[PDB]
Assembly symmetry: C2
Homo-oligomer: 245 residues x 2
């Protein structure tokens, strides 16, 4: 009966969350059988390439992978903790890293693909991607299903070195911190984030509201606002759980 | 074993085909259960409003409805044809027309909707529509399914006067002309379209190619190009069916 809100506390976590989201959307509506499925797929690809054009994700994500290995290394001597399970986890990190750096250009396969590039151009036009403006797509959707599935696989698997490394670090961020109980007065809250990239906030579906998070330096502030901007309102004592990961 | 290609021969048919496509995409992936379904829905709405902003569809579509009534009126005296079936069809046209003109602003309900407008802004940003940038959407997808379905219904039904009238005329355009057998030499063809808005072209899935249609005045020209820009090519005698609707 709870709703989890994730909020990035730096431009790093923003990009990673956007990329994580865009990548998993590719594999959500498979297989591609119709226009809807195709346009959903290609647009997610198109939006992925646009994010990639903004800089090099490779360099940041590789620094983050190394960062996590050093943290796990701090836990070796601790009583009770098991060695061969984190060192295997460390070994998976170095593997995800070595593959990422040795990987080709990111999104280049998708960038160079004739059909995808031909759809990418027509996406910026509201009614652009119809059958008469994309006969090439229209004829592609009449092909045997097995031919499309093979193309889709090669397209998604080209993002495998990135997908791996990224999934690794986000899975290790979301496990680094526990949910601490906090309370808000009149729908307001603030704290010093510190050295965290991600806030994880559990509310309540029945609580009738959502968090609006702002930031300054390494500090954050939450103003809980009612989903209904008119019919419903914050209490003066709102209990919630928040993790600083 | 055939593939049908539709191509608009004027700016009218272009708009109508784009709108027809956008409207039916709304009802394709229902119900909205996740992000993918939601983003697909809202973007189609957003693209619909952008097309509406470009002019008044109402005026053209109403002139087209009247146009079809006059054509049906020409068929009254013809032997063999049945009266009460076209006059009922005529009566449905005048009904679709009277409702369209008496209808409110087109897309205004969707335009004014808080959630939709809040998503419309974030659609122009590649990774914009994530959970942390749209907490309002994130919390909406956690609501009971019955609440979303009710909202979706009110949203789609607001387009009912337009959807009706439009579906009427396109259904009457696609029935006005028969498929005549034609042949192309070395993948080229041209004719005088005349008073037609739509070309309907049947090829063959095994034919290994698609039509690339250009236009000048009321004339059109087709250059059949191989789907594989490298591995496959047009014959020198390509038989196909084409209707000038």
């Amino acid at each position: 009966t709870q709703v989890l809100f994730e909020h990035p506390l730096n431009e790093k976590m923003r990009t990673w969350l956007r990329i994580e989201f865009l990548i998993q959307q590719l594999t959500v509506n498979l297989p591609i059988v119709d226009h809807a499925g195709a346009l959903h797929f290609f647009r997610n690809v198109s939006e992925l390439l646009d994010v990639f054009e903004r800089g090099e994700v490779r360099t940041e994500l590789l620094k983050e992978l190394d960062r996590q290995q050093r943290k796990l290394q701090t836990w070796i001597g601790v009583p009770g903790v098991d060695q061969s399970r984190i060192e295997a986890l460390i070994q998976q990190l170095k593997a995800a890293g070595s593959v990422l750096i040795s990987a080709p250009r990111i999104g280049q396969f998708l960038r160079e693909d004739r059909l995808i590039a031909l759809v990418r151009q027509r996406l910026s036009i509201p009614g652009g991607c119809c059958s008469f403006d994309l006969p090439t797509l229209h004829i592609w959707l009449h092909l045997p299903q097995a031919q499309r599935d093979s193309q889709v696989e090669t397209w998604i698997a080209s993002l495998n070195p990135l997908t791996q490394a990224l999934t690794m670090v986000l899975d290790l961020i979301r496990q680094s911190a526990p949910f601490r109980k906090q309370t808000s007065l009149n729908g307001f809250y603030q704290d010093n984030g510190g050295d965290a990239d991600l806030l994880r906030l559990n509310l309540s579906l029945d609580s009738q509201l959502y968090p609006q998070i702002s930031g300054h330096k390494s500090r954050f502030a939450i103003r809980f606002m009612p989903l209904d901007t008119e019919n419903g309102q914050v209490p003066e004592r709102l209990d919630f759980e928040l993790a600083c990961c």
